[PDB]
Each structure stands twice: as structure tokens, then as C-alpha cells.
């Protein structure tokens, strides 16, 4: 809350880039706004977006800059996860502690539990991040939790 001018800025500059990809007319479709903030840093969740507008159908409700901006201010807050947090999820699955998870199982979580990730994603995600199996056919979650958090652009 209380953005700045190096902050409120990269917002409109993005809202703009996203107002054009659904027709330049001064507004942005809700649904596609959860994908506005992502690019803008924060990592809100489905519920999170919904609970401020984020429709399900594309073309149900379209927010104009201001009327949109506010709901962006409140997504920042939302419980943004963390290693230790993430790191645990995969562990309660590590029936060995060795630090692995049958990709099988792994692609099960991301797919099955919680907020299901499009089966479209995952493969995608694990494929840029590059998540190569290994002998056993399982993965070492750790390096992945890091990779995913590192953002697409590392060092």
C-alpha cells in the first residue's frame, strides 16, 4: 500500500501492455489481471485475485486503470510463500528424506492438490526451468523450489 513513482509507474506501463492485448480501449479484462500482477512482481493466488474481482470468464468484467489499480494494492499483502514453506510441501512427500520425489508424484501435486495448475503448465514450467529426471525416475525438488523462485531471469 502507498505505491511510489518507480512503482505506481511500471504498473500503468504494464496495465497498458495488457490493455492492448484485448483491445486498446483504456481498460483491462479482470480475469486477465491476475496475469498483470504476476509480471508486476507479486505472486497472488486464484482465490486472492478472485477476492478482488478476478473473474473466471474472460470478458465478464473489465477494469479501468484506477478502478483496477486499487485491487493491485491489495494483492501485494496476500501470503506470498517461502522456501521453508515450499520446501516442506516436498518432504511430507519425501518418504526417504533423501530429497527426492518421483516426478510422477511431483506432477501429481502441482496438478491434483490445491489450485490445480493447467496440465498445460507444468510441462511448460518443467521444461524451461528444465527439470531433467535421473536414473531412478525421480527428482530432487529442492533445486526447483530455488529455480522457480529464481524467476526466469537468474544471474
Amino acid at each position: 500500500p502507498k505505491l511510489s513513482q518507480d512503482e505506481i509507474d511500471d504498473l500503468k506501463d504494464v496495465f497498458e501492455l495488457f490493455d492492448f492485448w484485448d483491445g486498446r480501449d483504456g481498460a483491462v479484462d479482470a480475469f486477465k489481471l491476475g496475469d498483470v500482477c504476476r509480471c508486476l512482481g507479486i505472486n497472488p493466488r486464484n482465490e486472492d485475485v478472485f477476492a478482488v474481482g478476478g473473474t473466471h470468464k474472460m470478458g465478464e468484467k473489465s477494469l479501468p486503470f484506477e478502478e483496477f489499480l486499487p485491487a493491485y494494492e491489495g494483492l501485494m499483502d496476500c501470503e506470498q510463500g517461502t522456501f521453508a514453506d515450499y520446501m516442506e510441501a516436498f518432504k511430507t512427500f519425501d518418504r526417504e528424506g533423501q530429497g527426492f520425489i518421483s516426478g510422477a508424484e511431483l506432477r501429481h501435486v502441482l496438478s491434483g492438490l490445491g489450485e490445480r495448475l493447467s496440465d498445460e503448465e507444468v510441462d511448460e514450467i518443467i521444461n524451461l526451468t528444465d527439470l531433467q529426471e535421473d536414473l531412478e525416475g525421480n527428482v530432487k525438488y529442492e533445486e526447483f523450489v530455488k529455480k522457480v523462485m529464481a524467476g526466469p531471469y537468474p544471474d
Binding site: 492492448f20 492485448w21 484485448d22 483491445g23 486498446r24
Partner: protein, 126 residues
């Protein structure tokens, strides 16, 4: 550059006041008035030719650019976007196209198997 300053044959006094053409262009079809020279504020000359005429070429890109502009949506260098994709990138994207703008565009815009070829389109659209 000057393949411009040409013409002046076939058109019609001195800088051809009215009806340059008409005499000059009914030898084959069924010509048009006083707008095709009403919209000739000018008058005539070659003065602000490069001004009024042309410069109406604003935003008019290179046939290597526009062709490239299309390329970003098919970098499997297939040199093709699937119709619908374009049919949708124009009608519902950027500064979307009106049912008519669209109707015209895809008139002789070359397609096959549902496969558009920007890699001619340009050529035909200049």
C-alpha cells in the same frame, strides 16, 4: 525520389487545372466529378506534393519489417500463422479491426488448409 515527379502525360493548360484525366481515362472503363480535384486543395504544382500527397505514408513500413512483424507469431519459421490465430489477433487485439476492415483484409489474403502466408500478403499489399 523522382520516379515520383513523373506522370504529366496522359493526365489531361499548364499544370492541368481541371479534368486532367477524364479524356485521359475513359478510353477503357467508365470513369467517375469535382472531388477528384475538390480534394486537390493545393493547387497543383509539385510544391507541397511531397507534403499533401505522400507523408500520408505515415507509419508505412518496409516490406521486410511488416513481414517481420508477422514473424514473431510463428517462429517455427513456418512462415505461416493459422488463420484463426490472425483472424483473432486482428479482430480482438491491439487496435482491433472492424467487421469491415476485416472482411476486406481477408479477401485475397492467401490461405490454404487453414494456413495464412504473411510471406506473400506483404508482397501483395506492397
Amino acid at each position: 525520389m523522382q520516379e515520383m515527379k513523373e506522370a504529366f502525360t496522359m493526365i489531361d493548360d499548364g499544370f492541368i487545372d481541371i479534368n486532367d484525366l477524364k479524356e485521359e481515362f475513359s478510353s477503357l472503363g467508365r470513369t467517375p466529378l469535382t472531388a477528384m480535384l475538390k480534394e486537390a486543395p493545393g493547387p497543383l504544382n509539385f510544391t507541397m506534393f511531397l507534403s499533401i500527397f505522400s507523408d500520408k505514408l505515415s507509419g508505412t513500413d518496409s516490406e521486410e519489417t511488416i513481414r517481420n512483424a508477422f514473424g514473431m507469431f510463428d517462429e517455427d519459421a513456418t512462415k505461416k500463422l493459422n488463420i484463426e490465430y490472425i483472424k483473432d489477433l486482428l479482430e480482438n487485439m491491439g487496435d482491433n479491426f472492424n467487421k469491415d476492415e476485416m472482411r476486406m483484409t481477408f479477401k485475397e489474403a492467401p490461405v490454404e488448409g487453414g494456413k495464412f502466408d504473411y510471406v506473400r500478403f506483404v508482397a501483395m499489399i506492397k
